[PDB]
Amino acid sequence: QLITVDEKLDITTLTGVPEEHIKTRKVRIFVPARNNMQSGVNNTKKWKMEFDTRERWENPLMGWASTADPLSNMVLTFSAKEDAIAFAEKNGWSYDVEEKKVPKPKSKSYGANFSWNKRTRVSTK
Amino acid sequence: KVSPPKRAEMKTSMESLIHHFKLYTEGYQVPPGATYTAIEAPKGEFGVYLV
Amino acid sequence: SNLIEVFVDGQSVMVEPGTTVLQACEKVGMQIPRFCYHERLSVAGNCRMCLVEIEKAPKVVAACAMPVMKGWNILTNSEKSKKAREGVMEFLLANHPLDCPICDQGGECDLQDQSMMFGSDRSRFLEGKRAVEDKNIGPLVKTIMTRCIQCTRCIRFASEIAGVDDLGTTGRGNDMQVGTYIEKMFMSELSGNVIDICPVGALTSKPYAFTARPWETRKTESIDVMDAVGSNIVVSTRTGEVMRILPRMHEDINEEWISDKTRFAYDGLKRQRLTEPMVRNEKGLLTYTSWEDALSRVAGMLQNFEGNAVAAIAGGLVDAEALVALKDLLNKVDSDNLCTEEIFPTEGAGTDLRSNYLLNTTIAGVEEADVVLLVGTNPRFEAPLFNARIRKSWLHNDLKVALIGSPVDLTYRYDHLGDSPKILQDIASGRHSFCEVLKDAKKPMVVLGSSALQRDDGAAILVAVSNMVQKIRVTTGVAAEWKVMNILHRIASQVAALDLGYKPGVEAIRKNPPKMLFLLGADGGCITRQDLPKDCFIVYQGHHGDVGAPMADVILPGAAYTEKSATYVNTEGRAQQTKVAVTPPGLAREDWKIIRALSEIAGITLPYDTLDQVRNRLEEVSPNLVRYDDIEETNYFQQASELAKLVNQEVLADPLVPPQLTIKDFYMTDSISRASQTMAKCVKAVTE
Amino acid sequence: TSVKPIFSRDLNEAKRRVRELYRAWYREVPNTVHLMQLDITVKQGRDKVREMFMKNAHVTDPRVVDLLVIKGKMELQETIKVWKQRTHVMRFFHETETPRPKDFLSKFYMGHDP
Amino acid sequence: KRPTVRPRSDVTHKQLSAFGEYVAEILPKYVQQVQVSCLDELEICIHPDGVIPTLTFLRDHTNAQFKSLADLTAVDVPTRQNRFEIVYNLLSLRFNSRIRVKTYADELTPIDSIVSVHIAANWYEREVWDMFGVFFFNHPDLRRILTDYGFEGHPFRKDFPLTGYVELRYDDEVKRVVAEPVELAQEFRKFDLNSPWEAFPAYRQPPE
Amino acid sequence: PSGEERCIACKLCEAICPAQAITIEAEPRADGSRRTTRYDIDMTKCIYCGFCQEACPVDAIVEGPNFEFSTETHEELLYNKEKLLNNGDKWEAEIAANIQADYLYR
Amino acid sequence: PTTNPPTARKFIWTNHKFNVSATPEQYVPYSTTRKKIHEWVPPSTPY
Amino acid sequence: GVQVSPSGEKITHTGQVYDEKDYRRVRFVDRQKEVNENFAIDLIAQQPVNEVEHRIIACDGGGGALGHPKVYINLDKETKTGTCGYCGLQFKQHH
Amino acid sequence: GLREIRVHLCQRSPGSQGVRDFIVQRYVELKKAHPNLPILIRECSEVQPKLWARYAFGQEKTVSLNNLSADEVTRAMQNVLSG
Ligand code: SF4
Ligand code: SF4
Ligand code: SF4
Ligand code: SF4
Ligand code: FES
Ligand code: NA
Ligand SMILES: [Zn+2]
């Protein structure tokens, strides 16, 4: 039988995460920007949740990249902006959302390259 | 697009080199789905549930 | 009410007339394979990779060019479409070189990736391949043209985005080669963008060459501060190191391009860096010390002087979280001499009304005007991506463009009204012949460059242009929601400084020289130890050792824009934020926490301990500095004009000559540009 | 805002299970200290019990308090049956870990972290 | 006949559709969806209230007799409200068939324990609780099974970091193994491998 | 055979390594060649799967026939580029003959 | 090898070297790259 | 070649060498800096330029399948040689 | 000692309608009265109108202008400019 819980969901105390990485961490909810070297748009559909970058330093022995941040490689994937916010909410991470950047629809026209009197007349194919 | 070509072809054909490069970096994409595969391993049913 | 209906595999789409088959498939979410087509270049139609079957037609149409006709069923995945793609991909690869392991594209190559998705897995080509000799077209773009697939994206980009009709195709048939025939350098403030739009490794970046692979790198979506356009960028890092800057798409700002300074000057972030606090020892030389030691000196001096005796100057690359922090500190010792190296006329309204010092029509408003009047500015170099948006309107919307100033080269044709700023008097009256155009303009746009307001008669020019626009607003009858008056800034921290009430220009310091000067990243060399009292305490906080550092008593190593989450406000007034890509080197610290650390040592602790609380404080001052990515409309220009008609200062007769005449002066302007070994090559490249 | 309960129907019926778990943990410190031959005092052990119960003093959702009680019983059982070792029990006391200063200046001197 | 593409069969897919309708007609109170994949595997997706009745019928019914619990496991999908998908893979030796029964859970909505149906599940439900923090009602002995004693967190949750938060070393000062915050000489390098081009037109999602 | 390194810093051995055991950095050389400035194998992460041998398009990285190289310290099992080139020169006579005996099966 | 000698190369070691672990010849790892971030050098003269 | 720094440490073929005051030099005390002495840059420069007749020549590095992927080099730019991007061999046209 | 006045307001929320009228009628006259004083007008969509005055040594006080009228705004601004 149901009960009334007049409070927002918080599961921080159950996740076994140190206090350090719940209160001082800022997540970034966003759709990745298209990699500009390629034309495919298949990595621009889902929402991502990433954590603020923390220090990396050089290992004295080898020069490798050392880290003391356990969440540096954490990348959650979500279907909707709302699902990503809820997940950060119930986990206590302070979030920061960026709206989806879609490519604005453009007017194309092959026949415009040969305009009798407009500057869109190309000088070379 | 799944099993890499022969090394001799990798060093001769432009399709073979590309497929070698993608298979050994990104790997092949598997269509979305789930499967439960089991075999009679020497100890008994050895199963993989793969998503 | 003219949206025809088309079908993509059966699903119906209502598209505008004139939409192509390729744009029709965008709407049902299907992306057509391509190489030659690019949404921001003129359609070419030669790669034939977009051939797509239309139901009931025998031949295959080029999806990227064929306009869509109502009642069509586009079969993006039929057998004809799949076979056309296999055949076409098979030809593209026949003469391509086995270069993927030595190619900087590999791992992010549209030719690699579209061959895996749409091509075949075999080669039946048993012949020899072609090999084309490479061209040397400058120190930024490496050409390995055997990899070219003759898609002509470079040719169209250069011609129509850079306005540099110097790339073309010579030869014919299978011997056809892209390039320049002669030996020319493709030097342009936008030339580095051919690296992005070239779909293969034919055009790659020399500075970046061989250094990393795409899968390795971590992408941090940040902003660019080399100028005031605030281009959205992506910073690739690998193992705590910055690899390359790439454009992030933002339709209303930089679209998909960045200037070469944005793209290639990051290597100045790795030289001449301040990594350790420094103080002067007994022989007068700077020596490394500790943070607790160094702050202890500045607090000790700050506790003495108050009021006019303490002043600060903000440089060209300072974040709003550090301007507001440095403002609060100095206001807590009575001082108000918070200044910026950039000059902005403080007569009339001054910075009272945002509309006075912003780009009120915005960057995307250029696309709607039908006349642009440029007053004292070389937009090609001050705002390279704003000149890109002008030429685009010059090309498509047939924008008329006029230039009051020097006859610089803008990459398009413009009417040169003259250089004497007496011409503003003429046009306002109605004498000048340009007014015949203005009477025919329903959307005028006057852009006054910040470079023209540095003149000794800066106030007069701004008042004149402010008045020539009050005649345009009634000589043409414009609506209240079309803004005509604009200011084009060239410094990243300028707009946010004025938002927070910094005094524009270092003129107050010349009036009342301070006994303590805070150089917060200032490097313009405006105030030198000959303008200041004998033995004056100077604290330099920055991230490069250039001009401010060697004259400092104390050096405080601050972060760079790649190394902090900071707020910058572009020329439109849009607020946007960077993000940490790497952390500051050595003992450098985030710039707003040094001033907060300093404030506690000196007993006047500031009321903020985290980035959150500092931005909340930014809100308390100017609440539009937390509205990220948002243009806040501003009115009350009429009021600023009414306060500008009373200024009794008059315009000198000096011709309006911008600081940058040629691409030579473009490459090295700020501290990071000057620490870059790639920009030094570019300077040496065009010079010799 | 209606949800299935785990065990408790509201916070008051859940605090009953909390105090009952705190009793059991309180009775077991003198044994853990005696059987595991820990080098602490009972008072110091019992204080540590109280410290862990107060780490979750802000929880209010009754379902959450059910799952903290469920976990705490599992932790109690791991200790009574000596499935844990000295190392495991002594991990609660963070004896080798220097604690990070909570003041701005000390953090500022020590690195980039907030 | 294609020497590279897997033989497709025909009869098995038809048989498992018939049994899927069978199961859905009989347990309409619990069944939410029935599907058969192109691999030819029957899936029953039930409301979590229906777990025990659904596995009981499938075990004891005469035209089912799925008497072996091949395994029980969870999948973490954070985008869903009920982020835990519980999967039961059952085996019928009588009919030489297999069947997958799936339900869901969240962090604060425990599932009933089927230990009364399949003793095999006893440790499987301990592993789900340990790795995903999904509580089971009426489990005879619900306690960690795979993680170290006093390990905090559920490491197979997608938001749990790969290397965890703590690590162990021997400290000669206190003469025992101690736990300390994790610092790696070399960080795990994340590779962005996804191709930006779509590989399967058959799974494309509408852009609505 | 001329003494030039085969490795061209393609980084495919690095992308495949199941253990993330290989670290690589590269830049243009003084003569413009594409070559590594760093090449490490942490032989304590390596699982000796041989996948890097398969991924290499120019037979630069191989697993030789040596198996008797146990050390007295952990640090000696972190191989940098100098060490790996030295193993190449040490074992080439035998590596070349094993590839000659097996490349036709590859 | 007395009947099938290995192919001669100018870089192949002439002198073998056995396991040098524990000795003063032992390998010692180090980073083979050069410094990345270059620091500013202050002027050597008063202002 | 194996230049030696003023500090006395050998310089590797990638130009690395610990500074004078870098403490990290302590790892070589009573031990040695592993350095490979056959600088590939120096060895590749010793090879003579192969002369060929045709204007386009294929290099696979030798050994066929035991070399590198087969590529072609243009030889038109009759002022510099054509260099293989894999093995670094040089080619020049006969006339 | 008054050092600076800041006026916040929305461009189109009626709660700030009174403040906008104050700007258009009085700002030009008020500025001529105090050519040296910095008076900052910083509009922002959907804010609460406010009036921040910063005094010597960083002391700041905020009068809230929500749902006032031009006459009631000029009085509040006159309080700050005077005493
Ligand atoms: S452009 Fe480079 S990576 Fe792409 S297919 Fe050609 S050689 Fe390979
Ligand atoms: S150089 Fe690049 S962009 Fe230009 S035609 Fe060749 S492939 Fe296309
Ligand atoms: S053999 Fe070792 S180095 Fe090579 S891929 Fe396998 S784990 Fe990595
Ligand atoms: S060893 Fe082979 S796979 Fe690895 S980087 Fe060098 S050439 Fe590429
Ligand atoms: S994309 Fe249409 S022909 Fe090239
Ligand atoms: Na390119
Ligand atoms: Zn070669």
Curated annotation (Swiss-Prot), chain C:
Residues 2-80 form the 2Fe-2S ferredoxin-type domain. Brain. More abundant in neurons than in astrocytes (at protein level). Its EC number is 7.1.1.2. Acetylation of Lys-56 is observed in liver mitochondria from fasted mice but not from fed mice. Its main location: mitochondrion. Residues 217-273 form the 4Fe-4S Mo/W bis-MGD-type domain. It comes from the Eukaryota. [4Fe-4S] cluster 2 binds at C148, C151, C154, C198. It is found in: Mitochondrion inner membrane. [4Fe-4S] cluster 1 binds at H96, C100, C103, C109. One of its GO terms (biological process) is aerobic respiration. It is a peripheral membrane protein. One of its GO terms (molecular function) is 2 iron, 2 sulfur cluster binding. Residues 80-119 form the 4Fe-4S His(Cys)3-ligated-type domain. CDD domains: fer2 (cd00207), MopB_Res-Cmplx1_Nad11 (cd02773). The modification Phosphoserine is found at S433. Pfam families: Fer2_4 (PF13510), Fer4_NDSU1 (PF22151), Fer4_Nqo3 (PF22117), Molybdopterin (PF00384), NADH-G_4Fe-4S_3 (PF10588), NADH_dhqG_C (PF09326). Binds 1 [2Fe-2S] cluster per subunit. Binds 2 [4Fe-4S] clusters per subunit. [2Fe-2S] cluster binds at C36, C47, C50, C64. It is an enzyme of class 7 (translocase). One of its GO terms (cellular component) is myelin sheath. Core subunit of respiratory chain NADH dehydrogenase (Complex I) which is composed of 45 different subunits. This is the largest subunit of complex I and it is a component of the iron-sulfur (IP) fragment of the enzyme. Complex I associates with ubiquinol-cytochrome reductase complex (Complex III) to form supercomplexes. In astrocytes, less complex I is assembled into supercomplexes as compared to neurons. Interacts with MDM2. Interacts with AKAP1. NCBIfam families: NuoG. Belongs to the complex I 75 kDa subunit family. This is NADH-ubiquinone oxidoreductase 75 kDa subunit, mitochondrial. It comes from Mus musculus.
Swiss-Prot record, chain F:
Binds 2 [4Fe-4S] cluster. It catalyses: a ubiquinone + NADH + 5 H(+)(in) = a ubiquinol + NAD(+) + 4 H(+)(out). Its cofactor is [4Fe-4S] cluster. The keyword Metal-binding applies. It is a peripheral membrane protein. Its EC number is 7.1.1.2. One of its GO terms (biological process) is aerobic respiration. It is found in: Mitochondrion inner membrane. Belongs to the complex I 23 kDa subunit family. This is NADH dehydrogenase [ubiquinone] iron-sulfur protein 8, mitochondrial. It comes from Mus musculus. The chain holds residues 107 to 212 of 212 of the full protein.
From Swiss-Prot, chain H:
One of its GO terms (biological process) is regulation of mitochondrial membrane potential. The modification N6-acetyllysine is found at K70, K92. It is a peripheral membrane protein. Keywords: Acetylation, Electron transport, Membrane, Mitochondrion, Mitochondrion inner membrane, Respiratory chain, Transit peptide, Transport. Coiled coil: none annotated. The keyword Ion transport does not apply. It is found in: Mitochondrion inner membrane. GO terms for cellular component: mitochondrial inner membrane; mitochondrion; respiratory chain complex I. Mammalian complex I is composed of 45 different subunits. This is a component of the iron-sulfur (IP) fragment of the enzyme. Accessory subunit of the mitochondrial membrane respiratory chain NADH dehydrogenase (Complex I), that is believed not to be involved in catalysis. Complex I functions in the transfer of electrons from NADH to the respiratory chain. The immediate electron acceptor for the enzyme is believed to be ubiquinone. Belongs to the complex I NDUFS6 subunit family. This is NADH dehydrogenase [ubiquinone] iron-sulfur protein 6, mitochondrial. It comes from Mus musculus. The chain holds residues 21 to 115 of 116 of the full protein.
Curated annotation (Swiss-Prot), chain I:
Acetylation of Lys-50 and Lys-61 is observed in liver mitochondria from fasted mice but not from fed mice. It is found in: Mitochondrion inner membrane. The modification N6-succinyllysine is found at K50. It comes from the Eukaryota. It is a peripheral membrane protein. Its main location: mitochondrion. One of its GO terms (biological process) is aerobic respiration. GO terms for cellular component: mitochondrial inner membrane; mitochondrion; respiratory chain complex I. The modification N6-acetyllysine is found at K50, K61. Belongs to the complex I NDUFA2 subunit family. Accessory subunit of the mitochondrial membrane respiratory chain NADH dehydrogenase (Complex I), that is believed not to be involved in catalysis. Complex I functions in the transfer of electrons from NADH to the respiratory chain. The immediate electron acceptor for the enzyme is believed to be ubiquinone. Complex I is composed of 45 different subunits. This is NADH dehydrogenase [ubiquinone] 1 alpha subcomplex subunit 2. It comes from Mus musculus (Mouse). The gene is Ndufa2.
